[PDB]
Amino acid sequence: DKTVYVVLGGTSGIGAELAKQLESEHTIVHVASRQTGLDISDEKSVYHYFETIGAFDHLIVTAGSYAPAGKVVDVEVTQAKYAFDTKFWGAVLAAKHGARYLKQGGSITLTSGMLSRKVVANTYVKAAINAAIEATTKVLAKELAPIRVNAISPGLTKTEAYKGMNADDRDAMYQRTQSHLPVGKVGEASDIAMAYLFAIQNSYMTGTVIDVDGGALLG
Amino acid sequence: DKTVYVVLGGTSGIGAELAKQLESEHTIVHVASRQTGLDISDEKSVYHYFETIGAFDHLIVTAGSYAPAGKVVDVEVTQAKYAFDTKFWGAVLAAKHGARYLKQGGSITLTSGMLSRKVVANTYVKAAINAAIEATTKVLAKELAPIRVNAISPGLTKTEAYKGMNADDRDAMYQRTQSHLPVGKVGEASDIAMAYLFAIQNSYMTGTVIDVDGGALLG
Amino acid sequence: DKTVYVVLGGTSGIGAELAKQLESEHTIVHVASRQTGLDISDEKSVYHYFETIGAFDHLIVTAGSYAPAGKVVDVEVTQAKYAFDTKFWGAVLAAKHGARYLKQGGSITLTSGMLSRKVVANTYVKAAINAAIEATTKVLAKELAPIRVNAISPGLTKTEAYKGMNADDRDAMYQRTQSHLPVGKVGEASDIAMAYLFAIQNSYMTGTVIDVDGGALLG
Amino acid sequence: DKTVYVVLGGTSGIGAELAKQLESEHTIVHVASRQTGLDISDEKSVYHYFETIGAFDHLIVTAGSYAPAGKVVDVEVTQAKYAFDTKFWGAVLAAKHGARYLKQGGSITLTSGMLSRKVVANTYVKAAINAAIEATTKVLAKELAPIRVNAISPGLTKTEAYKGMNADDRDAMYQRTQSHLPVGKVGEASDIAMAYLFAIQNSYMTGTVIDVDGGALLG
Numbered sequence: 008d009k010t011v012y013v014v015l016g017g018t019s020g021i022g023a024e025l026a027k028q029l030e031s032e033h034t035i036v037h038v039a040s041r042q043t044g045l046d047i048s049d050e051k052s053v054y055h056y057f058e059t060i061g062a063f064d065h066l067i068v069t070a071g072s073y074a075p076a077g078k079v080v081d082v083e084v085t086q087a088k089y090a091f092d093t094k095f096w097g098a099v100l101a102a103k104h105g106a107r108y109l110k111q112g113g114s115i116t117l118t119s120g121m122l123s124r125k126v127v128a129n130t131y132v133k134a135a136i137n138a139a140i141e142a143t144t145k146v147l148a149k150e151l152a153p154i155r156v157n158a159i160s161p162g163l164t165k166t167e168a169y170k171g172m173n174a175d176d177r178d179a180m181y182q183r184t185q186s187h188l189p190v191g192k193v194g195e196a197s198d199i200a201m202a203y204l205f206a207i208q209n210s211y212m213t214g215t216v217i218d219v220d221g222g223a224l225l226g
Numbered sequence: 227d228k229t230v231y232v233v234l235g236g237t238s239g240i241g242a243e244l245a246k247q248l249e250s251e252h253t254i255v256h257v258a259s260r261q262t263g264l265d266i267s268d269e270k271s272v273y274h275y276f277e278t279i280g281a282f283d284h285l286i287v288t289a290g291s292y293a294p295a296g297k298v299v300d301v302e303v304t305q306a307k308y309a310f311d312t313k314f315w316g317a318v319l320a321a322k323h324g325a326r327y328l329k330q331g332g333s334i335t336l337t338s339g340m341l342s343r344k345v346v347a348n349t350y351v352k353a354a355i356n357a358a359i360e361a362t363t364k365v366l367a368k369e370l371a372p373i374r375v376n377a378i379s380p381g382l383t384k385t386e387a388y389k390g391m392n393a394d395d396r397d398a399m400y401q402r403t404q405s406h407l408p409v410g411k412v413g414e415a416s417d418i419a420m421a422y423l424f425a426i427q428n429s430y431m432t433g434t435v436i437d438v439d440g441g442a443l444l445g
Numbered sequence: 446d447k448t449v450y451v452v453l454g455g456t457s458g459i460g461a462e463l464a465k466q467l468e469s470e471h472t473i474v475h476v477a478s479r480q481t482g483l484d485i486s487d488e489k490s491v492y493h494y495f496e497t498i499g500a501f502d503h504l505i506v507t508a509g510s511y512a513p514a515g516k517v518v519d520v521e522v523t524q525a526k527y528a529f530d531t532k533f534w535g536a537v538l539a540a541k542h543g544a545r546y547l548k549q550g551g552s553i554t555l556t557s558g559m560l561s562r563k564v565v566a567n568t569y570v571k572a573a574i575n576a577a578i579e580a581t582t583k584v585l586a587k588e589l590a591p592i593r594v595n596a597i598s599p600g601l602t603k604t605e606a607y608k609g610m611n612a613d614d615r616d617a618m619y620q621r622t623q624s625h626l627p628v629g630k631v632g633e634a635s636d637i638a639m640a641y642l643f644a645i646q647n648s649y650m651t652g653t654v655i656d657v658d659g660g661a662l663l664g
Numbered sequence: 665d666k667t668v669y670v671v672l673g674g675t676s677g678i679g680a681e682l683a684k685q686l687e688s689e690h691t692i693v694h695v696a697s698r699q700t701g702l703d704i705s706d707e708k709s710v711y712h713y714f715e716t717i718g719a720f721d722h723l724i725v726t727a728g729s730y731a732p733a734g735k736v737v738d739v740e741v742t743q744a745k746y747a748f749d750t751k752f753w754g755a756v757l758a759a760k761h762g763a764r765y766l767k768q769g770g771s772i773t774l775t776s777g778m779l780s781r782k783v784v785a786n787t788y789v790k791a792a793i794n795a796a797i798e799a800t801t802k803v804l805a806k807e808l809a810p811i812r813v814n815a816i817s818p819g820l821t822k823t824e825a826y827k828g829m830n831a832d833d834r835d836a837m838y839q840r841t842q843s844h845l846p847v848g849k850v851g852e853a854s855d856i857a858m859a860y861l862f863a864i865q866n867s868y869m870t871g872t873v874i875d876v877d878g879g880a881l882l883g
């Protein structure tokens with residue numbers, strides 16, 4: 008029978024691109040997010056979601072690109088916690104309730120981001136979330152073995168994550184990046200998708216965080 | 227003009243030992259926690275606390291030793307969020323409202339723990355919290371400069387943190403650790419206190435995480 | 446028109462498997478090592494090797510699986526230095542003289558190994574070599590941009606690397622690993638080759654070290 | 665029965681400052697370098713040296729500040745290997761022959777430097793050396809237990825290490841760093857020496873790398 012994928016966050020950006028690349032005659036690709044009725048921050052919603060999916064092979068979580076920007080002294084802690092509730096706690100909830108459905112040879116692939124390790128002013132919420140994701144990924148890899156668990160850590164990537172910026176501001180952001188990254192380009196969703204596919208396919212990889220950040224971490 | 231310290235969590239274990247060591251004729255040492263009326267997880271309570279203290283030199287946070295032990299698939303997420311609310315968000319709140327009172331030459335020293343980087347089954351809450359603390363320590367060091375910000379990362383230390391274990395259990399934990407660690411002993415509070423004093427004293431250290439873990443990280 | 450690859454160490458184990466996977470109607474794959482007349486430890490030999498190849502697209506270095514095992518206090522430093530001359534200095538020399546031949550879109554992929562970061566008694570030579578490779582990889586990524594530079598860090602993989610072992614001891618080594626790694630198998634060369642293909646393919650990745658170690662780093 | 669220190673590299677800069685601070689009525693401090701007849705890169709010289717000293721308590725190695733600056737593609741590999749021979753292999757040799765003379769409760773403290781982990785163009789030799797030192801430090805901590813083994817990782821410090829610079833360019837270097845660093849100053853030898861004293865003093869620390877870099881790693 009077909010290999011079955013669940014992509015929480017697969018309705019937009021990196022997750023949607025991955026889901027697109029995963030579709031074939033030999034696969035079933037489920038995507039879900041708030042717009043499909045799933046709130047990954049909500050434990051009951053996640054629990055009942057997997058109940059309806061049943062046994063599957065690979066879980067990928069890309070949900071939750073929002074975080075309040077700003078200095079620690081200025082950021083509203085309520086908004087920071089909200090951000091944590093989706094990206095961090097949502098991944099925890101997805102693993103907690105999804106793992107029991109994973110078939111032999113399956114895996115979980117979470118998402119962090121280079122701010123876990125690139126120290127940048129005004130980014131503590133993103134950095135803390137990503138650091139937590141990477142640590143939890145490794146604990147999960149140990150606890151769920153032989154189910155494999157890894158994380159992809161993207162650098163700046165052109166997606167809907169930035170649909171709320173003024174378009175000119177967005178372009179200037181992309182251009183600054185292009186101009187200062189060693190690779191001399193901004194990431195495309197398909198560049199990041201490739202890394203999830205690699206984690207999914209490699210039966211000798213678990214507890215790993217794969218950076219795809221155009222050299223951003225090199226400072 | 228005495229040097230003024232604030233130790234949030236200074237009423238027990240590691241904080242208490244440090245507070246004791248900071249006491250002198252040329253210092254004033256404030257300690258606080260729930261038993262003195264400070265709930266570090268409550269923003270208005272933290273704000274009130276620093277209003278009562280006024281200008282001071284060094285802030286140290288050791289508060290929040292609790293975390294629900296167990297596998298990701300077994301741990302109660304409400305309890306996990308509770309732990310985060312004290313140790314992680316408490317540290318965030320303490321920096322956020324304490325920073326403006328720090329005098330020239332001042333510092334903030336937070337507390338993580340070797341589980342940020344030592345991967346151990348059944349410890350995701352502690353590991354995630356400590357990873358978040360370490361990432362946030364570094365962002366703070368960048369944002370609050372020239373105020374210095376560092377973190378102490380302890381290994382197993384004999385304190386009231388374990389007061390709620392089956393006494394048979396705790397002794398077994400202590401003996402097994404003493405048996406397996408390169409240094410052949412469990413940590414004493416004074417060993418860890420020494421590290422805060424070092425962070426406080428060193429005008430050339432910021433953004434650093436100091437491990438005092440008896441070699442546990444070496445596996 | 447065709448994409449040209451150079452694999453130094455491509456005559457055995459991981460390098461040979463990679464070279465086999467790179468072969469196609471669209472590519473030209475060159476492999477080299479001592480048995481083909483290239484000693485990667487010898488600067489003149491390396492310099493003259495690249496003259497004979499001319500312009501190419503991707504350099505991969507897997508050469509040098511040997512290192513004297515044993516405690517720091519016991520290991521013959523002369524033999525330790527010999528191991529460095531091939532695997533570490535070899536990589537340096539290949540980058541130093543090969544870089545100027547790399548076409549637009551090109552990349553260098555080096556090889557380290559999990560012992561860079563998994564602390565194991567009796568392995569200081571392998572650990573130090575791998576640590577040096579990973580650091581040099583990142584410096585190279587910055588210096589050679591937009592040429593991309595990454596490293597693959599393998600865990601235990603069944604190859605000719607262990608041809609010097611008694612066959613029974615080797616089977617037992619493999620089995621102890623299979624029995625204890627989270628993924629419950631020993632690495633095959635094709636599992637590691639997959640990672641080099643990924644690094645070659647991803648135009649948004651540079652300065653990255655990719656672990657494919659079956660979970661060994663999780664301890 | 666006084667406590668005996670050996671500081672290889674103790675005739676200049678950081679090592680000399682530490683030697684000065686170690687002097688006491690209850691200590692004996694030995695310093696040594698080429699100018700005293702110890703060439704730490706030469707195994708028989710190192711062996712001879714420890715025969716002359718006999719049983720002692722704490723070994724500190726600061727020897728070998730030199731390295732050829734420049735890009736991988738430009739640096740003379742002979743000079744690069746010379747740098748490794750002193751700072752890296754010298755530390756290896758010192759531990760190898762010094763370890764057997766270490767009294768109960770003793771320790772080894774080595775020196776790396778922030779470039780192990782801060783990626784900077786034109787620094788591969790220093791970066792690789794320091795990465796190798798940090799990895800070897802941890803292996804030694806495991807192998808020599810209960811002897812404790814740690815390393816200090818300095819950032820820019822005002823010492824004789826920069827004597828060979830055009831006194832104009834050296835001032836440019838100091839001033840530029842003072843203005844870029846979070847702590848707003850260049851390191852003084854005493855700042856770094858403090859960290860060795862802390863490693864020597866702490867019976868619960870081993871396998872640890874202590875950064876004292878004024879925030880350089882924060883980027």
Ligand SMILES: NC(=O)C1=CN([C@@H]2O[C@H](COP(=O)(O)OP(=O)(O)OC[C@H]3O[C@@H](n4cnc5c(N)ncnc54)[C@H](OP(=O)(O)O)[C@@H]3O)[C@@H](O)[C@H]2O)C=CC1
Nearest residue numbers: 019020021040041042046047070071072120163164166168
């Ligand atoms: N693009 C970049 O520059 C970077 C990307 N990333 C990380 O990669 C991941 C994906 O990023 P990206 O594809 O660009 O983001 P997008 O904004 O394009 O997509 C975000 C997705 O998350 C879903 N989502 C948000 N909240 C919830 C929720 N409460 N429950 C269920 N689904 C939710 C969204 O759908 P819906 O609104 O319907 O819920 C959407 O499908 C994120 O973790 C992001 O932080 C990391 C670093 C850099």
Ligand SMILES: NC(=O)C1=CN([C@@H]2O[C@H](COP(=O)(O)OP(=O)(O)OC[C@H]3O[C@@H](n4cnc5c(N)ncnc54)[C@H](OP(=O)(O)O)[C@@H]3O)[C@@H](O)[C@H]2O)C=CC1
Nearest residue numbers: 235238239240259260261266289290291339382383385387
């Ligand atoms: N001991 C060990 O083996 C390890 C220690 N640590 C870490 O070191 C730090 C201190 O540990 P330790 O000294 O052993 O802990 P203790 O359990 O001895 O002390 C904890 C302190 O935190 C205070 N506290 C708890 N909750 C709050 C709150 N909501 N608001 C204000 N204060 C609070 C407590 O006082 P009160 O109840 O009155 O609020 C108490 O003063 C912790 O971060 C811990 O995780 C890290 C790794 C290993």
Ligand SMILES: NC(=O)C1=CN([C@@H]2O[C@H](COP(=O)(O)OP(=O)(O)OC[C@H]3O[C@@H](n4cnc5c(N)ncnc54)[C@H](OP(=O)(O)O)[C@@H]3O)[C@@H](O)[C@H]2O)C=CC1
Nearest residue numbers: 454457458459478479480485508509510558601602604606
């Ligand atoms: N297999 C494993 O378990 C592990 C593998 N690795 C690393 O991966 C890399 C490759 O491993 P593996 O494929 O298994 O090793 P193999 O021993 O199968 O192959 C090693 C290759 O290096 C070549 N070589 C050795 N010395 C020189 C030299 N002086 N000049 C040119 N070529 C040389 C060999 O060919 P020739 O004899 O003709 O020179 C051979 O092609 C190594 O860096 C190794 O340390 C890392 C960790 C785990």
Ligand SMILES: NC(=O)C1=CN([C@@H]2O[C@H](COP(=O)(O)OP(=O)(O)OC[C@H]3O[C@@H](n4cnc5c(N)ncnc54)[C@H](OP(=O)(O)O)[C@@H]3O)[C@@H](O)[C@H]2O)C=CC1
Nearest residue numbers: 676677678697698699703704727728729777820821823825
């Ligand atoms: N100052 C800085 O900005 C930084 C310092 N450091 C590191 O700290 C350590 C010390 O630095 P620093 O004190 O400034 O350097 P110094 O140049 O002041 O001192 C170097 C010492 O090493 C000795 N030495 C050199 N070669 C040998 C040898 N072959 N055998 C025995 N001894 C030798 C020298 O004496 P002699 O000539 O008699 O041999 C001298 O005592 C080094 O590892 C350095 O890399 C790390 C990062 C930044």
